[PDB]
A paper describes a structure:
As a scaffold for aromatic cluster design, we chose ferritin as a protein cage platform with a 12 nm outer diameter and an 8 nm inner cavity, composed of 24 subunits. To prove this concept through protein engineering, we focused on a two‐fold symmetric inter‐subunit interface of a recombinant horse spleen apo‐L ferritin (Fr) as a target region for mutagenesis. Herein, we present the construction of an aromatic cluster with an artificial molecular binding pocket at the two‐fold symmetric interface of ferritin and explore its ligand‐binding characteristics. We developed a system that uses ligand binding as a driving force to induce and propagate changes in the orientation of multiple aromatic side chains.
The resulting mutants were named Fr‐F2 (Fr‐[name]/[name]), Fr‐F4 (Fr‐[name]/[name]/[name]/[name]), and Fr‐F6 (Fr‐E53F/[name]/E57F/[name]/E60F/[name]), where i in Fr‐Fi represents the number of newly introduced Phe residues per ferritin monomer (upper). Within the vicinity of pocket F59, an intricate network of aromatic interactions is established, comprising three phenylalanine (Phe) residues (F52, F56, and F63) in Fr‐F4 and five Phe residues (F53, F56, F57, F60, and F63) in Fr‐F6. Analysis of the 2Fo‐Fc maps revealed electron densities corresponding to Nile Red (NR) at the two‐fold symmetric interfaces of NR•Fr‐F1, NR•Fr‐F2, NR•Fr‐F4, and NR•Fr‐F6, observed as overlapping densities due to the interface symmetry. NR was positioned between two F59 residues, forming π–π stacking interactions in an F59–NR–F59' configuration. In NR•Fr‐F4, a change in the χ1 angle of F56 was noted among the four introduced Phe residues, but no significant orientation changes were observed for the other Phe residues (F52, F59, F63). The quantum yield of Nile Red (NR) significantly increased from 0.50 in 100% methanol (MeOH) and 0.38 in a 50% MeOH‐water mixture to 0.88–0.95 upon encapsulation within Fr‐F1, Fr‐F2, Fr‐F4, and Fr‐F6. Furthermore, NR's fluorescence lifetime extended from 2.87 ns in organic solvent and 1.26 ns in aqueous‐organic mixture to 5.23–5.75 ns within these ferritin variants.
Author numbering:
A (entry chain A), B (entry chain A), C (entry chain A), D (entry chain A), E (entry chain A), F (entry chain A): 1 to 173
The structure:
């Protein structure tokens, strides 16, 4: 087989392909989230833009993973992309809760892959994840947690008002 | 009669004149809406500016229609302009509801005229409507629907607060 | 009623609303004049542009009047807008004669309103009219009189030639 | 045959080739018109330039049609180009009358082709015509009608004077 | 249901959702094509970049469709995304053949949707497709056909040489 | 007849008209050549652009001839334009061979006309041809001969490869 492959296990190759699938699924989920908040009967522009930026971020993550797979001499293999878990995403709070669950699952998949790289003595893979993924994910989950807290603080007894204010004064538009 | 007229039915000519009347009536309605929200006892600058921009837009629509009537060799005929349906327009919500009703009526008149053009095999008219009117109208009705949803979300139990916040944080001033 | 209204009679309020109606009717008349001279079988661009500029001027006059009505704490009330007095406007001479008749009627309405303001000891209204309307109107009627004289001088025995030359060499295109 | 052709009827292909022939014939007619008005014994520069600009416009129309034929996977087929209908074109009025007749024939050919596209459910062809041809033609015929009216107004009893003035004060030089 | 929806059939809404699925599948196919040509054992940079640009184009198409669905008051519904039809894509010729098959299928889906819009008297949908999709697709299929012809001309008896030269001298890098 | 004509024979006048016909026929031939190489199943952009530039050059030649005819007081007379000699033009080699045959025929017509001018003692005509036509033609035929030699050198046993390389590395795109 490969004229470049070196120190790159079949286990890591497969796991990288699985992780691509997870990132692309996450991108799709965020595309659905974005268009839901674009509905005339939802109409929260800042929320919309927040989730579309994440759709792009997750697609970029997948792309970098696929680039690395080729740089290492593995073979990119694509699978079916499962549709997102919901067709409607409820409130901004419901959506941000679903997004943090999603991110925590991606982070766990990154950690799992890092551990596999470590067991396989694959330092390039370990560094790749550390340099492009693990801190980005920590930073994103922190920001989502910050948002959750602010959204929650605003529910009070006037939920609509709080939802509008969060979109207007925290999220970008 | 006309040295330029070609493929331009009397039915379309008349319907174009009727549509001009509808656009000018819509412009007038929006002028009334704008000055109501300019009242010292209403005083919602952003709402005022939103409806004045629409008064100008609807006048522009009428002007383009009249330009096209002449380009086709039809004869512009003006009728009495009915005053707007109300002298006072209630809340921002009441006003935005009235505006979307108005826009839906204009859109239906555009669709009706497009259908007439299609039946008469008048592709220039059909393209004119598609290129300058139908998508502008879809975009406007979408924006009004977005606004309605945000206004509605803000009523809650503190209607005045919500009305102020919508004007301050969504509409332009 | 009004928390701002001071020294502003019901008579002036009503007369201001009537004057708005007159200005908007004048704007409409000028819109009709403009599109007539835009006809392929009339085709006098300079005349067209002259009357469209007046349509805009008269609309601006109405707008300023409505702004002032609100600044004084009166209530803008709109009525039906009568269509213009003609559907076709004849020669440039016929049109300019009709325009000066129209302007003289507006000027008389301004003078009448000024007199009412004076009788009611309403100096703000009197100054408003003097500052934004009376001299603009004198200047416009003078310019129309100048035009009439030039158009008349050009009729001679070659009316078409004179009509073309006036449009080409006096009016803007 | 063609590796790209899709939804593109033989009838439309042939009609497009015929329309190319019509446009190129129109270009040739305008070339003849231009050089006639360039004669020392005619010498109307503005008229000359007006018809040369149209020769170029009609050639561009043909070129776009031929580009589209290839984009659709049809085969451009050229036929003999009939010489223009006259060798001398009379007055500016005679020439502008001949030009509007010509344009009306081109417009009818466009409408005929649009109808064929519609019957064949060929929306690309229908849009192509609407986007690049039908409104350009309406605008041109309107401008020619405007010119005819001005030329006619200037004949009066001093035809030479009127012909000179039209060329000098309306047409570009 | 919807406060904005007007003249927008359930049939069109569903078909738009189906078309989104087709565009996203096409984007995925092009992502796979791109990474295959990025393999160290394939290594055709220009081919890689050509297919990645198409992945982005097809994603943009899907996005515009979803935007329009919301502008019309339809509801975006996502389905599972089928993986691409192949894991390895053979030669540049094999790949470009597969890409033109794919594009022809998308074009047929656009035409089908346009026909449905026409039957339903939905001119906004018909114009949307004409303005953003049908000509882009014709232009792309023409370019692919051009490429196919050039690739085919280069096979001769030295296929590797021809594949290299096409990538180096036609495709962008 | 003519108030400007001087030293300008009927024989030269007629021959100039014939030469215009030849130039316009040549322009048409080059238009056909250009669109053939624009076909999806030919697809040689550089060849396409080479022949379109010549279509424009030959049209310019005709235009200059017609300008000169009027400057001399002759009368431009147009005839039917024969369609080009072929509907399909074969290889780049076949096309360039046909183009040099065409150019040699134009050059001979120029030389013939120069000789007629010389016999008629018409130095203005002789200079006009020398200054705007004879050297342009020599330069063009030299360039075509250069191209023929390069195309011929590239046929070898891999004709497609050679045809691609010539288009890519010699002709402009
Ligand atoms: C409202 C019924 N009527 C009287 C028939 C209106 C309404 C609105 C108008 N708005 C404009 C306008 C708006 C923006 C920029 C330029 C212009 C203009 O030149 C003339 C106008 O004339 C109007 C007449
Ligand atoms: C009149 C019948 N024939 C010969 C078939 C014409 C007529 C007009 C033409 N006008 C152009 C032209 C005009 C403006 C800018 C570029 C071009 C050009 O590149 C080629 C032309 O070729 C023409 C051929
Ligand atoms: C391939 C299947 N999936 C997951 C559903 C894709 C494919 C391609 C995509 N391309 C973009 C994209 C491309 C250019 C510029 C911006 C963006 C963007 O913001 C989001 C994207 O998201 C994508 C998802
Ligand atoms: Cl599968
Ligand atoms: Cl009446
Ligand atoms: Cl009433
Ligand atoms: Cl023949
Ligand atoms: Cl499912
Ligand atoms: Cl003949």
């Amino acid at each position: 087989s490969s004229q470049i492959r070196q120190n790159y296990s079949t286990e890591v190759e497969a796991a990288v392909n699985r992780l691509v699938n997870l990132y692309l699924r996450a991108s799709y989920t965020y595309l659905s989230l974005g268009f839901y908040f674009d509905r005339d009967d939802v109409a929260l522009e800042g929320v919309c833009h927040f989730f579309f930026e994440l759709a792009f971020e997750k697609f970029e993550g997948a792309f970098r993973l696929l680039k690395m797979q080729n740089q290492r001499g593995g073979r990119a293999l694509f699978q079916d992309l499962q549709k997102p878990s919901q067709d409607e995403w409820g409130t901004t709070l419901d959506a941000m809760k679903a997004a943090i669950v999603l991110e925590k699952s991606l982070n766990q998949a990154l950690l799992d892959l890092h551990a596999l790289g470590s067991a396989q003595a694959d330092p390039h893979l370990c560094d790749f994840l550390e340099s492009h993924f693990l801190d980005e994910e920590v930073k994103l989950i922190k920001k989502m947690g910050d948002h959750l807290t602010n959204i929650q603080r605003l529910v009070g007894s006037q939920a609509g008002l709080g939802e509008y204010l969060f979109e207007r004064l925290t999220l970008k538009h």
